[PDB]
Paper text:
For complete catabolism of both trehalose and maltose, the isomerisation of βG1P to G6P is catalysed by β-phosphoglucomutase (βPGM, EC 5.4.2.6, 25 kDa). βPGM-deficient [name] is unable to grow or has impaired growth, when the sole carbon source is trehalose or maltose, respectively. βPGM is a monomeric magnesium-dependent phosphoryl transfer enzyme of the haloacid dehalogenase (HAD) superfamily. The active site is located in the cleft between the α/β core domain (M1–D15, S88–K216) and the α-helical cap domain (T16–V87), with closure of the cleft through domain reorientation occurring during catalysis. Two phosphate group binding sites are present, a proximal site adjacent to the carboxylate nucleophile and the catalytic Mg2+ ion, and a distal site located ~8 Å away in the closed enzyme.
Author numbering: 1 to 219
The structure:
Amino acid sequence: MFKAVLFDLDGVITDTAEYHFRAWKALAEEIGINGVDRQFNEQLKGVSREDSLQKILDLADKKVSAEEFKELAKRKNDNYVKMIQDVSPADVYPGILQLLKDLRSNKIKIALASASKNGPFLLERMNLTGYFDAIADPAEVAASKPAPDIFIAAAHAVGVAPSESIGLEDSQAGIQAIKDSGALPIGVGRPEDLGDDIVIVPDTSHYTLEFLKEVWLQK
Ligand SMILES: [Mg+2]
């Protein structure tokens, strides 16, 4: 059987998309840039903090120093961290808590493979820390997704090779990172975004222990 499951956070366990949006909108209002509405915010999902800020500045052809750029990015992050104080167990995606319970009762290892600097905090707020055997520290990896580094670290941290593991992801870059690690990917989303050479489910309610076992069998 597989010996471990390697979880992304955003888009698999939960999301904090409403909070990132309110933070960028508040920042744009403060500095007087029109146009940061829900539809525009779709261009910021999956994009780095610094690329997101540049896209906002480009709405007004605005030019800033390195020091001003750093301060704006810090203000947005400060507001984002204040707002995620209200994350709770209600924010866990459908199916995820049952999957965690079933993996733990079958002695299958569980690891977080997320780029979030707030990963341990968010798991504590959702009451999930007791299910996790390890959290890969994104500060200690050399390269981000689609590089495999974070998935290799997550598997190693629970004492397995990536070839013994399943990885769960909602992004094309994450799926590529899983493939290149040697783990088996199962995506959540649609093949237009994720590829059509991997198994995909439409939402997280479909991630059950029996479905993972069927996928591993067919491989
Ligand atoms: Mg994700």
